[PDB]
Each structure stands twice: as structure tokens, then as C-alpha cells.
Amino acid sequence: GIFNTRLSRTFGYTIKRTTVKTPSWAVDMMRFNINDFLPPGGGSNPRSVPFEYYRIRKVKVEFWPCSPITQGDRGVGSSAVILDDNFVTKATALTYDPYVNYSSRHTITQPFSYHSRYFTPKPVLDSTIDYFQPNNKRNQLWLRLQTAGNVDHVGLGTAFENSIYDQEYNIRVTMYVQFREFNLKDPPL
Amino acid sequence: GIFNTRLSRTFGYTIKRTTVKTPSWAVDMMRFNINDFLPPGGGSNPRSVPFEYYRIRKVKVEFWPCSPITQGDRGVGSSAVILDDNFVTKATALTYDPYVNYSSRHTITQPFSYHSRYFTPKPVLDSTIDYFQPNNKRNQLWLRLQTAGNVDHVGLGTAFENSIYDQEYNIRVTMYVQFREFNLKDPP
Amino acid sequence: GIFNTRLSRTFGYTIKRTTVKTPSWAVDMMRFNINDFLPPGGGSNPRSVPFEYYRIRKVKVEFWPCSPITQGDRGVGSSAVILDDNFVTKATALTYDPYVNYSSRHTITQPFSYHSRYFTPKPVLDSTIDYFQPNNKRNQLWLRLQTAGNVDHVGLGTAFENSIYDQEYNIRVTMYVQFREFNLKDPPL
Amino acid sequence: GIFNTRLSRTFGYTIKRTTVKTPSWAVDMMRFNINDFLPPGGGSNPRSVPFEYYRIRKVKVEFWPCSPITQGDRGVGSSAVILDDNFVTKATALTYDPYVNYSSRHTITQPFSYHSRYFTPKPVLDSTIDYFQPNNKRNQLWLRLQTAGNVDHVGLGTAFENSIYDQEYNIRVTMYVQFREFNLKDPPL
Amino acid sequence: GIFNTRLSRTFGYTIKRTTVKTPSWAVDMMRFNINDFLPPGGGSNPRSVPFEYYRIRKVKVEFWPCSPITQGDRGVGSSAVILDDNFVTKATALTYDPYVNYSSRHTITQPFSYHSRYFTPKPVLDSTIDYFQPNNKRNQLWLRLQTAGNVDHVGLGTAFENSIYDQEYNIRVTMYVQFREFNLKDPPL
Amino acid sequence: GIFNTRLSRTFGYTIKRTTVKTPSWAVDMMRFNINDFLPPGGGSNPRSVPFEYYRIRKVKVEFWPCSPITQGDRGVGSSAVILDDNFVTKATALTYDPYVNYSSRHTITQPFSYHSRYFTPKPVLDSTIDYFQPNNKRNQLWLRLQTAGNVDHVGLGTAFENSIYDQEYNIRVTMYVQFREFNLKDPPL
Numbered sequence A, C, D, E, F: 001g002i003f004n005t006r007l008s009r010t011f012g013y014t015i016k017r018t019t020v021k022t023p024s025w026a027v028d029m030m031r032f033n034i035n036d037f038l039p040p041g042g043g044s045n046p047r048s049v050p051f052e053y054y055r056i057r058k059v060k061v062e063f064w065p066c067s068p069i070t071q072g073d074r075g076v077g078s079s080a081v082i083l084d085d086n087f088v089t090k091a092t093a094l095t096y097d098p099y100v101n102y103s104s105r106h107t108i109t110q111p112f113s114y115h116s117r118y119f120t121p122k123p124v125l126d127s128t129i130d131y132f133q134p135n136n137k138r139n140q141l142w143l144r145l146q147t148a149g150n151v152d153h154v155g156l157g158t159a160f161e162n163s164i165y166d167q168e169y170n171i172r173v174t175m176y177v178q179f180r181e182f183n184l185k186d187p188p189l
Numbered sequence B: 001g002i003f004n005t006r007l008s009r010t011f012g013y014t015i016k017r018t019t020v021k022t023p024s025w026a027v028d029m030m031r032f033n034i035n036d037f038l039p040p041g042g043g044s045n046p047r048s049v050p051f052e053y054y055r056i057r058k059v060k061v062e063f064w065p066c067s068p069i070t071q072g073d074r075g076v077g078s079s080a081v082i083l084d085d086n087f088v089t090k091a092t093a094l095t096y097d098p099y100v101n102y103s104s105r106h107t108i109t110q111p112f113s114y115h116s117r118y119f120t121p122k123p124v125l126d127s128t129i130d131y132f133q134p135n136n137k138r139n140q141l142w143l144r145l146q147t148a149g150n151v152d153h154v155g156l157g158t159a160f161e162n163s164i165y166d167q168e169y170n171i172r173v174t175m176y177v178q179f180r181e182f183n184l185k186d187p188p
């Protein structure tokens, strides 16, 4: 019983100002979990979408700027796809862009420019070995939609060039999911 | 955001014995409401299934017997589709079968036999005037999925020949619905 | 169980004389109900036609004159189709023909001339909103054939030019109906 | 104004037990009249189906058993079509099956078995001469739908083998009729 | 007597400022009635467009901004189509965008960006059951053009992200309507 | 914004009796103005049909008789088309039919006979020079729909033969007009 749908979530991210003169970059990570998109249900149905299995097909991360188009001290960054839960260490002012030479690098124009990334994440099945599957719609694993313990999906790391002014963003993540085995429970009343 | 699916429910129905000698029948109706099939949800989502709209396509009533095959005093009855919520009056022992001559009559063997009906019900918009639409998948209306006030649908009435023994059935209903407008809400 | 048939009914209508010199018109309305065409039945069958549902397909209103061909002070009127239960107010001597500029106006030659109107009426489902369906034989609503409370169908308004002489008519309404679900009940005797 | 429809009626028939050891048969007859299927009407319409003429096209006699499938002392009988109102005399325990060598004989398995007969009856126009028409849909006579004096149609006789146990049946007769000349009368009220 | 035309109306909407730091959204509703587009007439014609029936085909809601392109604290919202008169409750600062996961969601870039929505509304025939028709130009119901009591059409709800600055808009609604049965009345003078 | 419609108006005309023995004719004129067909509107819309420009395409003058078919002293007259506002002088009993030799003459049988004339009128732009355009649907001038000062259109003159009895008529003029530039005004309320 397949049901392809779309789940979204919005949150903020700010790159604080720095008095540093050099071009330094701010590094951060981004994971994706389905608990943040799918709330708990009620009653005999533990989740709000009554299905048993799921598998995330795609994610769309949108960096919607919060800064005016008149803001100066512009910069240039990079967003890369990291499917293994080993990101570059979080840094405030690093002397280089680590994600620049990555094959999945897209340039981030800053601060007042929109940046989208559309990709297929991978689940963290074993963080010790960090193995994942290649892209195959027919062979992608089905995970279970747990009650409160779903596994973290992974796949984006960023590097933003710091500035004299604060750079704020409203980040909207949209997960395109595919459920299976409609499992609604209908007790009496 | 269409989503076809299937919902079901189970309950019992019995026909108490009668010392009457003549062939008499017992009458009873049957309504259909979605609140019985779809429990309430939790939190911001009032219903377990997050959509706004629905419109019933079909219903499948299943009279599963509870009796053995060796039971005697066999009889015969009838069921018919009634799309107005104005049925024949409920009765214990009536001297004729009202539902026999209706064009939508399907015979009912008794007591140990399976019986099924597969049709399109209709809603009750105005019980005074009792109007509805002909069968059309494209022009069917879209109803709202209320919080605790959904409308009763209709479409079946029955007539069972009485007997010396108690006739018990397990009734399974199955609905084929079609939702729209995925309306999930994700608070922090 | 479809059964298309034809039901008729006959009644009178008179436009009384007036001493008024001007050309004035007499306005009146005309509704259609199935109780006036279908009598009550007997016994377990509440109606004389043993069916459950109905829907009126067409109506033929015939103004059969009662006046001789030698009658003078002739006039000219109008009949229009009003599918919403909001007619022009009934008037005895109105200074104009209200139904003249209606798109459904047919001229009524008076007094000794035959006038027919053949159209599809509409039921009064909500008199507050006054909504109706367009003409579609396949999508027309089925109403219930009630016992003594059927709903009024609507669709004709008239305007007759007054005269020094009385203008009488014998009006024959014929409804072309379509029933469904033969529901005869046969108790013993 | 033709209207083909279907009228039904249900009643009981029992073959009482006998201590007789031999195989004996119980003989009985079955006539069909339209008064038992069509009740009287009400008012100016004397009958509930408002038509003038009729002619019975077919009849379906269904012997629905009332006995369990575990009942013993089973037997074998015969049902024949008798279109002339001269049946074998009614008998309780006759030493043979009279309807066995009839060209229209169908075997009746007893007691817990269903038996249907579908045929075209004939009316009793003259019981002295007992004449009837062959099967012709185009030339079949139209009778009048009388008020309380319709003529008996004929066409089935049976022979059931007796048993130590009582053999009950619920007999459902269905007549497929064809009416003509819709004659509804609509007085005022 | 069909006459397709276009009726417009302009009004304001402001999202007041908030000292709240989080990303919160301001929720509001939008209904459409023909009294706000069609004024009352004069004399025997109760309305200014002399027709009897109407049905709204489409509506175009245009959010024309009032804010300069230099305004900061930009945001992102959502507009959805709600054809049933049960909107998300009006809120000043809600912690999420309710209309984000709706199938009819269009993103609203704020504050200095134009947003249009072009759709087919539905009338509020029964607010208790809240039933409506699918899109069909041939089967769409005709309503009556009442004098002062027309029924509210429905179909848009919004969610605007709040800001430190006031966000003003000039909203221009354009209804594309279709009238029927020209009913002009011409008394003497 | 073109809208072709049809506007009507009804009024009386009587040819009084004369004791004169000779065959004499009664001459009269007939002009057409849109104020008599289109009433004043209400509010910001000065007219009831909300358009700016107009041009009359055709007019249908219908002489509907008021006299019985048994009336004697019958006669014969003439109706001609006069597109220039210079009619034959109005006369009570003229010794000849002036409109008889006109190229646009149609015979009027009197008194109990119907007479129609269907033609294209012309406006009175300059009564001193009396110039008009030939018939051309594509080149016909657009006039303005004034508030209370529209220009008179012209195009029919008649000659009725007098009689011992009074000859009454109900004259129904129907103008087929074509408007342009829908100009509805919708203030608030």
C-alpha cells in the first residue's frame, strides 16, 4: 500500500559576525530525521501517518535568506553532500573552505541569495562502518516507522564565509517519502 | 492529493427465535458512518488519517454466519438498497417480505449461508427532501472530514425469516473511500 | 426500474375586466407539484404509482382559450420561464409587461389564441439561496416521491394584457416524469 | 403502453408423514391467479397497478426446502406442466408416480433439494372444452385486469414421495406479466 | 443570456510587527462575496448588473506589496486553497506554518514580492456538512443574484511570517463571473 | 466589450373615425430614442445597462391590432422608411396615400391585420443637412449612451386609411442594440 507524499519543516540558522579580517569560513552539519517531520499520533495508532514502513526518496534543503539585498561584505561558500555521518568538524572561523573541492560542491552566494540542494539521503545503519547503498529506486531499503526512535538520515554539510554583519537564514527542509502497509487500527468507542 | 484505501469494522447481529408457526420475517435497517471506522487522532491532528476531504465509492457488507450447517428450520429472506434514510419500519415478525419485489433485491438463503452486497451508498444531506446524485465517479461530491460530526450514509435494509432457533451472524463492513488534501501539521 | 410516463391536470384561469383605458398587464405565477397530478394510493402503497423516486423531465403548459374568435379588444402578453421561486409580484393592472425583455419570453396573443410552453422545471431545494441545476438528463437529481409533502417545482410566469371583456382560459399542465425502484407491497388477504 | 414487470408471492406446502412402508406418492395441484399477486387499489383506481389489460408471459415456481441436509428417508418425485385444469386427483399415498412418464416431467429430489420450474401458463377460458394457445409472444391473448374476478391460470402438478418425517417447503411463485393501456384516474382533492 | 465579465475590488492587509525572536507566522482567512463587487442598483432593478443568476468561475487574488525592496528581515510563507469554510484558526504568532504541507500551497516570498493565486472557489451551501462540487464548467451550479443576501464563496487561507517591521499589502481580488437571464425592467417615466 | 441584446417597448396608436365619405388617409410619424427603452440607473452608474457606447443595429416595429376580425369598412395603407427626420406632414384626412410610391413601401392591410417592419435606423446627427450612412455593420458609428439626452433615431412613417369605426393598435418596438466598453463602478458600502 504505497503512498508517496511530502513533509516539510522550517528552522533557523545564523552565522554570527566576526572581527577577523581574513576570509574565514564557518562549518556546520545537517542531519535529517523523520521525528522532526512526522509527529506522534494518538491512541492505538502511534504515529499520525498510519503506515508501517518508510523510505526517504529525496530531500530538498532550501536556504531562504533573511538579509536585505543591500547588505555588503558579501562572500562565497560551498554545500556538499555527505552520506556517512563523518562531517568536517564544526568550526567558527576556519582559514579555508573544506567543501570546495568536493565533487558534490555547489557554490553558496551570500548573504541575500537563495540556495537549494536536492538529493537522496542515506540512513545511518552502522556508524562504525558507515556503509550505504547507491541510488536505486527499486532496491532501496524499507525502514520501519518507529514510535520515538527513528534513525537519522544524513547528507548535507555547509561552509559559510563569515562577515562583519550577521547572516541569518530560514532553512526549509522538505522530505519526499514513500510509505507502505497502511495499518490503521479502529477500536470501538 | 488523492488517496484511495480500505476501511473495515465488525459487529454482531442476531435474530431471536419465535414460537410463531407462520412464515414471518424480521426487518432491520443499516446505516453507515465514518466515525465508527476512523478513530480520532491526537494533538493538532484531530483525525488519525491526515486529510481534509473524503467521498465514499463503494461498500461491501458481509453476512458471515455463526451457525452450523446442520441447523434445520431453514428459511429465505431478502436485502435491498435504500438511499433515503426512510426505511420500512423495524419489525419482529411481519407476515410478508417487504423487500422482495424491490428491483435491488438479492435473495438471502438462511441460516448458514454467506451473503454479500457491493454498492454505492449515498449521504443524507436533507432528511426532509431526501435527494441524491446518480452514480458518477467524476461528479461525486467531496465531503469534509469533521471533528465529531460526520454525516450518516445509508444504503441497506433487510428482511430475515424467523425460526425456532436463534440465528446469529457476524457482520463485516468494508468501505472504499478516497481522500484528498493532505493536511498534516508538524508543530515543534 | 425506470418508467417514463405522462401525467396531466386541468384547471381554470381568468383575467377579469378593467375600466382602465391604458394598456395594463395582469401578472401571475405558476408552480408545479406532483401531489396535484398523482393522488394518494391505498393500503401499504402510499401512492397510486408504486415507485420510490422521481424526477420531472419536462412540463407542457397549454393555455386553451375559452373565448370566441369574434372577441375584440385584443392584446399581447408574455410568458417566461422562472426557475427560482422569485416571480414578479402579482399585479392586477401593471403599467408594463415585466416578462417582455426576458430571454425566455414567448408572445401571448390574446384572447382566442392557443399558447404552449415546453420546458424543464427545477425543484425548490433551498428557497433562501435558490440554486438549481442546468439541463442534463444524465445528472438530474432523483427526488423521493413523498406521501403528502412533495416539493414544489417552478418555472412559469405570465403577463396578460387586460381588456374590457373577461378573458378565460382552461390551463392543461402535462408533466413528463421518470420514476425508479418499483416498490409494490403485496400483503395477504 | 406496455410495462413488463415481475410479481411474487410466497406460501407453504407440507407433505405429512406416513407409517406406510411402501413407496407411495402424494399428489397435489397448483393454479395461479393474479389476485394473489396484485392487491386491490384505492379510490377511482380499482387495482394497485394502473393498467387495463394483462397477459402472463412466464411463471417461476421455486420449491425452497425447509428441511435439513441431514434428513433421511429421502425420495424422488416429479413435477409436470398441466395447462388444462384437469389434474391427477389429489392423493395422500398413491402407489405410483403419475407424473413420471409425462413429457414435461422434471425429477424432484427430496427433501432438502431445490426445485424450479419455468414455463408459460395458460388461462382457463372454457373449462368444459379446455382449449389453449401454443406459445407465441406476438399472438398471446390479452385478458382484462378485473377488479375482484380474474381468471385462474394453470400449469403445474406435483408428486412427492412420502416419508417417515414431515417434508415442508416454502413455495415462491414469481409471475412475469405484461400490462397495457395505462389508465390512471386523477380526480381533484 | 450568458454574459461573462470581470469584477474587481481592492483592500488592505497588514501584518503588524513583533518583538518575538523566533520564526512565527500570522494566519488569516479570506472569503469572497459578490455584494462587495456588485453594488445595489436603482429602481425596479435591484442590482446594477441586470441579470438573475450567476456562478463564479475563477478568482484572482493579487498581493501587491506596499514595502520597499530595501526592507530586511525577509521571510517565507504559504497560501493554500480552502474550499470548505473551516480555516486554520486566526493567529498572531504561531510557531509553525500550517499551510506548508497543503497540496495547494504556493510559497509567499515576503515582504516586497508579488503573489498571485488563480483558482475556482466554491459556495457555502451547507456549513454543517461542507459539501462542494469538483471543477466542471458544464455542471457548475447557478446561484441566484440576491438583493442583499448573497452567499459567501470561499477558497483562500494564508500564513505570513512575522517581522520586526510592518508588512503592508494592497490586495486586489478579481472575480470572473458568468451571469444568465437578462432581466431588465423598463417602467414608464 | 461587446454585448448585443434586445430592448422592447409597447404603446398605443388609434386612427379615429371620420364621417368623410371619400377614401382619405391619416398620416403620422414614428421616431425611436433609447431613453424610452433604457431607464436611468442608480448611483455611480447613470444608466441601467452599464456600458459607455451604443449603436442601434435594427428595429422591429409591430402593429398588433386591437380590432376584431369581423370589423368592416376595411382599408389599405402604406408604411415607408424615412431615415432623415423630414416626414410627410401629419394629416387627419388626406386625399391620397403619400407613402404609396415609396421604394420602401409595404402595404398595410387594415384593421385586423398584423404589420411588421424590420430595418436599420439612422441617427439625427445634423437636422439641417440630414446626412446618414449606408448600411455597413463594420463602419457604423458608435454613439455615446448619454444620461438624459440621447439622440433620436428615425426611420418610419405611416399612412392609414380612415374608417367609420375607430382603428386601435398596440405598437411594440424592439430595438436590437450593440453596446461597448463595460463601465461598471463599484464604490464601497
Ligand SMILES: O=C(O)[C@@H]1O[C@@H](O[C@H]2[C@H](O)[C@@H](NS(=O)(=O)O)[C@@H](O)O[C@@H]2COS(=O)(=O)O)[C@H](OS(=O)(=O)O)[C@@H](O)[C@@H]1O[C@H]1O[C@H](COS(=O)(=O)O)[C@@H](O)[C@H](O)[C@H]1NS(=O)(=O)O
Pocket: A035, A039, A040, A041, A046, A147, A148, B043, B188
Ligand atoms: O506523554 C506524552 O505526551 C509524550 O508524547 C511524546 O513526546 C512529545 C510530546 O507529546 C509533544 N507534545 S503533545 O502536544 O503533548 O503531543 C512535544 O512535547 O514533543 C514531545 C517529544 O516528541 S519527540 O517525538 O520525542 O520529539 C512521546 O511519545 S511519542 O511521540 O513517542 O509518541 C512520549 O515522550 C510521551 O508519550 C507517551 O506517553 C503517553 C502518555 O502515557 S504515559 O503517561 O506516558 O503512560 C502515551 O499514551 C503515549 O502512547 C506514549 N508515546 S509512544 O508512542 O512512545 O508510546
